[PDB]
Amino acid sequence: SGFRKMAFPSGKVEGCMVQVTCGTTTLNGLWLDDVVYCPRHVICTSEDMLNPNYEDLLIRKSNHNFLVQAGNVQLRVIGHSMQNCVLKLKVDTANPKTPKYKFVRIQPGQTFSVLACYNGSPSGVYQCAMRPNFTIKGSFLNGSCGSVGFNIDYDCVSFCYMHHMELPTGVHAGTDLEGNFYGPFVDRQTAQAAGTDTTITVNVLAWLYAAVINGDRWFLNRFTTTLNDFNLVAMKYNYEPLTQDHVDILGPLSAQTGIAVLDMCASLKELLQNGMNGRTILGSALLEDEFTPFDVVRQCSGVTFQ
Amino acid sequence: SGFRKMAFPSGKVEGCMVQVTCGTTTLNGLWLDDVVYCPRHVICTSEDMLNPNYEDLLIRKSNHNFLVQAGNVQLRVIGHSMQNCVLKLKVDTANPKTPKYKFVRIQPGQTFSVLACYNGSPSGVYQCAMRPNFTIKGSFLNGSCGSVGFNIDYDCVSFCYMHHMELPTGVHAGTDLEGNFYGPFVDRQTAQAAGTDTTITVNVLAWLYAAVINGDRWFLNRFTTTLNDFNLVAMKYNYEPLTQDHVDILGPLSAQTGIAVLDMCASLKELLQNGMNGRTILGSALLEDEFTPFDVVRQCSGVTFQ
Ligand SMILES: *[C@](O)(C(=O)N1CC(C)(C)C1)[C@H](C[C@@H]1CCCNC1=O)NC(=O)[C@@H]1[C@@H]2[C@H](CN1C(=O)[C@@H](NC(=O)C(F)(F)F)C(C)(C)C)C2(C)C
Ligand SMILES: *[C@](O)(C(=O)N1CC(C)(C)C1)[C@H](C[C@@H]1CCCNC1=O)NC(=O)[C@@H]1[C@@H]2[C@H](CN1C(=O)[C@@H](NC(=O)C(F)(F)F)C(C)(C)C)C2(C)C
């Protein structure tokens, strides 16, 4: 039993992390095959980052201007290009520990593990959700840029996130590994703020299923509701609409517990209107929206990776 | 910025996990050098586990009775002994990926990462505290036994926990890697329950410091208090006493924020007496006691491992 926020094991990703230095700027890079991927603002100074011309700064760099270091070894750059906000450095050595991997662009609502790195060395690992406003709520300091988020599927790492920047309210923004930002953020030290965020409804329901599985059932009421009705009540508590696709995705949890999605929707509608009344669910005093249905099944069935 | 529950990167431990099968029982083992360590109840059936004579069952086993498997490879056992509740299987092969490591017995209050495994393969990683009643609040299913908890210090893994059992209320109990249980639990399917738990005061204060560092300061009041007074108020909310050692351990956080431990103690005493009043700290609606002072510094300074 028990229900924890739980990240994917990081080992496959650890063996891909490098330090990338250009001038005085040092940040982390991802070494896959014979390419190092990092944020393009590695080629900036403090001055530069207020309004940088990245194509211009990069013109003026030679391969030797990029120190890439993998513990004790220093990799020699033999090529450099820019794809959107990502810099690609061709190195002379293929990473022997490159895992099976893919590049994905995740959807708002989806979770992943972040491997927080400083100076190309791992600090720690935690789980995050891509919020509906295209931010994440991470823990990142100076030097963390180039840290990556990932999902593991059996043996194959899907990289979906690279860390670039921090926004007001101390939430975080970044790119896919093709260098396209999630959301409307630019890699420029300029005033930018996140849109107001919503609660990911399907994830809250997934967490309610996890609660029931773990025996926490005080909140199950005896009513049903319609999808239509549920959505109207949830509209006012700033919950995203639940679509029929979402209902279908909750099918496994519904089936494993014998609670129709719409009975659970009934129970949540009550919690939103009456609040939690001095009671916790799975240890928590707030409703959690950072567990997907797959995460719950993963944790409550025992899905495993190598 | 930001503050997350964050585990140590798991890679060094991943390369030590094996599947250990004896008869129909399969659970996880830890392969260090040429020894596999696992819970001794691998040698039991369902029948057995109500009241097992472990010395007796083990007498009757040959080395060949132990299948040890490391992905595709099968290791040949060439020796077996029992140390307390841990079984030690000498294998014919040393693990090439054995990291620098130590065996530690942690103290109540201390945190570690758990690498949850099924069939000797990692499912995921999360952070836990050894609670004062010598339990942890994990996520563990059937097959998880032998999963280990660890701290990383630079390059050296300190294993402190191996998973054995689950108790009423769905909390968890286990041994150090020398096979001594934490707390008064026995490895026997018998009615056993955890003592009522306390809140780890020093950890709550460490979390308050993290809050301030992250800018969440609404709860700082303008008073001091004495250690004596603080402890009396905390006695009734089921907080452990704060000793002078604890005060000394909070020194770095106190120094980095310029808030005396006893000013912070003043602020906590208020929160305990007046409650949180519909407000969160670092996202949380409850006070958190599962971050040590070292964890906070680690996360808020950027300590890093390889
Ligand atoms: C990242 O670039 C990094 O780790 N380093 C750059 C140096 C060499 C200093 C180390 C850095 C990570 C953030 C730093 C503050 C704490 N948390 C972080 O995640 N990213 C940046 O500093 C980032 C780069 C320029 C400005 N950045 C940035 O994040 C700004 N944010 C904004 O301007 C905002 F619009 F609010 F998003 C702050 C420094 C936080 C003000 C660029 C975006 C290119
Ligand atoms: C662990 O032994 C394991 O993963 N497996 C044994 C098999 C082969 C079935 C796979 C197992 C882990 C727990 C299983 C329930 C869910 N969570 C777990 O962590 N441990 C046990 O089953 C454990 C062994 C016998 C009885 N165990 C146990 O945990 C009991 N608990 C108690 O008796 C209690 F006193 F409450 F602690 C339950 C099965 C949960 C009732 C032994 C203790 C040797």
Swiss-Prot record, chains A, B:
The active site is at 41 (for 3cl-pro activity), 145 (nucleophile). Inhibited by pyridone-containing alpha-ketoamides compounds 13a and 13b. In turn, alpha-ketoamide 13b (tert-butyl (1-((S)-1-(((S)-4-(benzylamino)-3,4-dioxo-1-((S)-2-oxopyrrolidin-3-yl)butan-2-yl)amino)-3-cyclopropyl-1-oxopropan-2-yl)-2-oxo-1,2-dihydropyridin-3-yl)carbamate) inhibits SARS-CoV-2 replication in human lung cells. Inhibited ex vivo by michael acceptor inhibitor N3. Inhibited ex vivo by compound 11a and 11b. Residues 1-306 are cytoplasmic. There is a cross-link at residues 5, 90 (Glycyl lysine isopeptide (Lys-Gly) (interchain with G-Cter in ubiquitin)). It catalyses: TSAVLQ-|-SGFRK-NH2 and SGVTFQ-|-GKFKK the two peptides corresponding to the two self-cleavage sites of the SARS 3C-like proteinase are the two most reactive peptide substrates. The enzyme exhibits a strong preference for substrates containing Gln at P1 position and Leu at P2 position. Residues 1-306 form the Peptidase C30 domain. It is found in: Host cytoplasm; Host Golgi apparatus; Host nucleus. It comes from the Viruses. Changing residue 90 to R: In strain: Beta/B.1.351. Changing residue 49 to A: Does not affect ability to cleave and inactivate human TRMT1. 3CL-PRO exists as monomer and homodimer. Only the homodimer shows catalytic activity. Interacts with host FBXO22; this interaction promotes the proteasomal degradation of nsp5. Cleaves the C-terminus of replicase polyprotein at 11 sites. Recognizes substrates containing the core sequence [ILMVF]-Q-|-[SGACN]. Cleaves and inactivates human TRMT1, preventing tRNA guanine(26)-dimethylation of tRNAs. May cleave human NLRP1 in lung epithelial cells, thereby activating the NLRP1 inflammasome pathway. May cleave human GSDMD, triggering alternative GSDME-mediated epithelial cell death upon activation of the NLRP1 inflammasome, which may enhance the release interleukins 1B, 6, 16 and 18. Also able to bind an ADP-ribose-1''-phosphate (ADRP). This is 3C-like proteinase nsp5. The gene is rep. The chain holds residues 3264 to 3569 of 7096 of the full protein.
